[PDB]
């Protein structure tokens, strides 16, 4: 160990270990991390403009509030790093390999490791037209690295806004610095005004009186890194549920017995449904028998007042709504019905994008998923279920209302394999959330990690002097980040007679995209992670 | 056990075991086998009719013998039980398994049995216009099985004709009548007459001096069954080599080392070729260094007349020639190139054809594999090798020949899933062939079984009366087959950082299709068995 | 009929080497020409037949002259293809190709990785227990007289 | 086969690249030139006709009775091992390199410079990403012989 | 497509047997191989070799990498006078990756002489590692009316069934700063022997000889016996003969 010996190897690759019905996924990942230092050497505490597209008027009459990013922050000079996706683990093949092989999947424990500090100054030299710059390395430079395993730090590590290191190993990852909010109150009031059609700011605020600000080096311990040093977190544990690797296609009509049919005679016929039977029902039904009003145990799916616009302190938010696919309503392509609670990825050069200074997208609409479909319009409800067909009256068709209750049965999104989030923070509140909206694993300790590194100021010969100077010398450093997560899955069996159709590239994609370019540029295929029919029951 | 008694369970279905790079397929199977009273209950020696559309005249001057039925054979009253084909084994969901997660699959070894064996006898009762017919179960009759294991009988079993047990597990089974050829002269001179248009039969006979009529009586030891009587034949052991389950797309233009390029500058451009390098050459090489001319230490594929029709003793047959896709060569779709040592299956409604009394086809034409792709009209060859260019002498463009030689690395076809024969034969002379132009599976000892059942004879009260009578009463039998044979295959894992591109339907194919239809009427679809790219070197 | 393996191989028959050393002869493959034999009188010797010449000692019973034999193999047949009498064809379908498309009298060597053949075997009188192994890259498969 | 070389290859002129061209003179009684060769109809007493003769077929001949020789080793230029392709049927003999490895062969040794990245990274805009580098180092082996 | 390929049918196809064209993907690795003749020995040393062995194997093989050193070229000057300054970075990296387990495309052997330098005293300089995708260059020779002219039938990258490996993801990677060394560990080979001897008899040379006479003197040729009992191959008496 010293300045002339490399701390730590390379590895980056997935092996896979089938016994039984058990497989062991475990993905090793290393990055090579470009870091500059830090803009500001202190911490600051500010609020935002409202944001980009937010009403100046009331031509839209509040509908525009929908828009809007005000919010209030603590930037501490630290960055982040954070291995919490899908694809900084995985290359296409191997979460194919995953997919196809595995009926469901679990977190096993998480390691990661820090080596190979590099730490440069740059120089200056000449008149400014010449302008020869010189990169010389300091050898004594620190570079500091903070780890909270006790989580007293605000989490704030997920991808919303894809702040995670790069899906493909061999380009480099710059990080994003740390940064998160503190109480304010946002309040919009969209009913304002007569007629109730104008919006108005009810109180618009950072509240200092009520606030909580809590430095990196006050909260953990700090390891400070020269070139030869390295650094290992340690092991972490998950302990979590699984996720279902296979999507489910069945309603409620699906589920049950089966309405007694006689079969076709020849291949033109259609079966054909018995009159007279004599099975259980809801209201008083008799003479019309039917699989509609037949009664089941359970119901799959709930309504939802779809695209709900919460409006909390703190500003407006979406309330999701269960994740289903729009595919059975979907009729003509060209409009595009989003009330699945379809999600839509954005995403950049290192996170999958062929082309660099622009931004490609995807949208998962959810098509698989079906028969958890309910959109809330098409539904209705009636008085009484009976024998009789209630009138005009008696029959509401566009009511919006929650249907969740204590008989439904719904699933949750799963892995959404490029850009998806691997883990989340569970909230600490009395009634702990049921099932989360994106990320697929809900740490019930804990959630690990939340690396932080920051890059120790280089100062000049004189501090504090102020007076239009630069405090400090201008520094960056790389560095080598790797670690691997264990996964256990359960081996994937047929259930069928049939072929199965199995994962693969999204249907409208062709193969020369997902491969590189001429110049090396190529995109990573969204894989649905909830890939193949499964019977719900 | 007795007459009340069921002597064994039905079981088809496969499981497998996945440890390490092993993985152990074990497929069980069953059928319901339908048996009738032997045709005659005498071994027949007799030759046929030449066959249908074979020429009785010199209007296409021979063209025509390639349609040659013509043989001579001994039919036994036996009939045929052989489990040699895949389909009988697996369905298409549980060989889409295998084809995933196996890179290349040995058989382990076999094992079959026969029991609940039911003999009946039909009793016709009335006038004949009222013609009441009675089915009486003959509870002493007996079943009777032979089983070769010591390979002394004529081996003739195998997938050529398609005489096999069915495919789909709950469909009743009927076994062909076994039978061999015995040597016979069927040689053809095509070249026969005045300027060599005519064709003529040189010597057409069955050649009784020398012959060898094996009966199975005294052959092999024959078990006799009642009702309450079972049958296993013991374990068999394969010994054979494995076969790859990946198609190979490299030719020797694929697989070298590459052409030394500088790389283009933008999306638009093309790689540009170094006109001056320093490598190996065939002849005198110098200016045109070329990779066409890059001298390789192996070649990958070979030229055959293809279509060769051998016209041997005993008729024309067919040399096969190397198996290879047509597709860099198929420009237009309309027409269909053959030459590829492509095959056809036809098939029944038993054997995964959909609709009864009508027979679908297939014709796989191999067109994964590439690489070893060589059409015999397209090649050529030069007097010398040399940075000139020859003349129009010294060049041949259409010879034909036969480029098989120690250099060349080939493929065999590899497992076809529904119609295609498991294991064959190995014929002992000096000089065993290398590989098989269509069974994956050489047995390198006997191969398994060959199973014989023949159905006791019920003579009436009388015997050898003859005078316009029947000698013996009218019976059938039903009985259950089952067997398993156990395969290992060696783990397959992503070898590539793209999406492979999994097993499957067939393209044109839809799903409609291989679903039970309205009367249950569906196809298997056909598998490729050799399903993914891999490196050839 | 597809089948798993092909019993013969047909050859340029009495193909003469011309090498450095002399013209030789490359034999190709034993087999019986009775299948095409026809009339006695002519002598059809392309089954790769061969000859023994034979003297006093050797068994001939007349001293001063040689008694010949020539074993044209009639016993093995299936394994028979006379090159000529062959032909290939562009396409094998349903249809029949034309007069183009078709080639009767090629000569072509059809040995390949999918054929069967056999050795001539054990000759009595004349014939050679044994041979020597040339050493070479690819020792011969087998022999063309020595069992 | 003919060799083309460089410099640090074994020509003594930098900028030019010297040539071989091994032809192989010492192998004879192997050589086979096709068109000298010939085939007659029936090898007999008689000599047959112009007819039954064939000068310049241009076939094929390997089959089961032939023997032949590898290349064998080329000094200066030729390789050592190679890869064998994995098909059903390897190959028999090699057309260049001397030695075949029945399991994988050896290493295939990469090495990569890491890269040097100035201040700031995807800059872009008509600049220069990474600092210009270059590396030296030295490789020594050793592979055993048994002759 | 090429050097000296054919834009026009003129020679009618004969010059398409210079053809370049391929599609390959090039990852930015340089390969280091010891893979010839030359890299390993000396001319004195082969000639020791090749007169004192009868026949030659491959034993076993091991190699390593060490004495790393990295420099940074730095420009210093106005551009007129272009000094440059050749500093080394003590805590730059090189990255060595070897596959044991052939999983990457193999593409390492002398055919176009990538290879280490023969003389020992000299530098040498790598080749980038690249290797092929599949592509359909197919060319008809046969194509047009009486078959003289030359097309191109199919000429394209094969995108949808192709796979690209990485060295990233198919081995480990090591990091070597200067102090560092790498080695890569007995390799043992399993071929067979090759003959370090040529074979000058044909089959005319091999057998046993055509029973002769000696000549009397300096001056005869051998006379070649007229009546022989030897075997032949079809009906052969009168003439006996080698050839036959």
Known sequence: SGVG?????????????????????????????????????????????????????????????????????????????????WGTWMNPADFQQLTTTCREVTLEHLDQTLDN?????????????????????????????????????????????????????????????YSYHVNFWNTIDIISGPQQNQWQQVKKEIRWDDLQFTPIETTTEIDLLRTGDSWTSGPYKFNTKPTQLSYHWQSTRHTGSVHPTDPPNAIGQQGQNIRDINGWQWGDRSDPMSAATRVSNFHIGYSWPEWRIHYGSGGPAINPGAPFSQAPWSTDPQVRLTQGASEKAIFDYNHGDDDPAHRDQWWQNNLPITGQTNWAPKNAHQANLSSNVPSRQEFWTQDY??????????????????????????????????????????????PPGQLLVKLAPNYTENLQTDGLGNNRIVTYATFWWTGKLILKGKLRLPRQFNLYNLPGRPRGTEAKKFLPNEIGHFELPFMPGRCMPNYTM
Not at 47 to 58: A, K, L, S, V
Not at 136 to 160: F, G
Request: glycine share 6%; proline share 6%.
């Open 117 to 177: 500090i590099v730490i440069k100054t740059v120089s200056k030299q000449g008149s400014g037209a010449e302008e020869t710059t010189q990169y010389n390395n300091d050898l004594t430079a620190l570079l500091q690295v903070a780890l909270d395993k006790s989580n007293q730090l605000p989490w704030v590590a997920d991808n919303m806004y894809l702040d995670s290191l790069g899906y493909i190993p061999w380009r480099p990852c710059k990080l994003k610095q």
């Open 401 to 446: 209302h929650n249907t969740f209750g204590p008989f439904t049965a719904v699933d949750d999104v799963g892995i959404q394999y490029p850009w998806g989030a691997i883990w989340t923070k569970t909230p600490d509140t009395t009634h702990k959330p049921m099932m989360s909206a994106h990320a697929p694993f809900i740490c019930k300790d804990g």
């Open 5 to 85: 010996h490399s701390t730590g190897n390379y590895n980056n690759r997935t092996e896979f270990y089938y016994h039984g019905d058990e497989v062991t996924i475990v993905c090793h990942s290393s990055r090579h991390i470009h870091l500059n230092m830090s803009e500001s050497e202190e911490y600051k505490i500010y609020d935002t403009d409202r944001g980009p597209r937010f009403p100046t008027d009331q031509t839209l009459q509040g509908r525009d509030t929908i828009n809007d990013s005000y919010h209030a922050q603590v930037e501490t000079p630290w960055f982040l790093i954070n291995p919490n996706s």
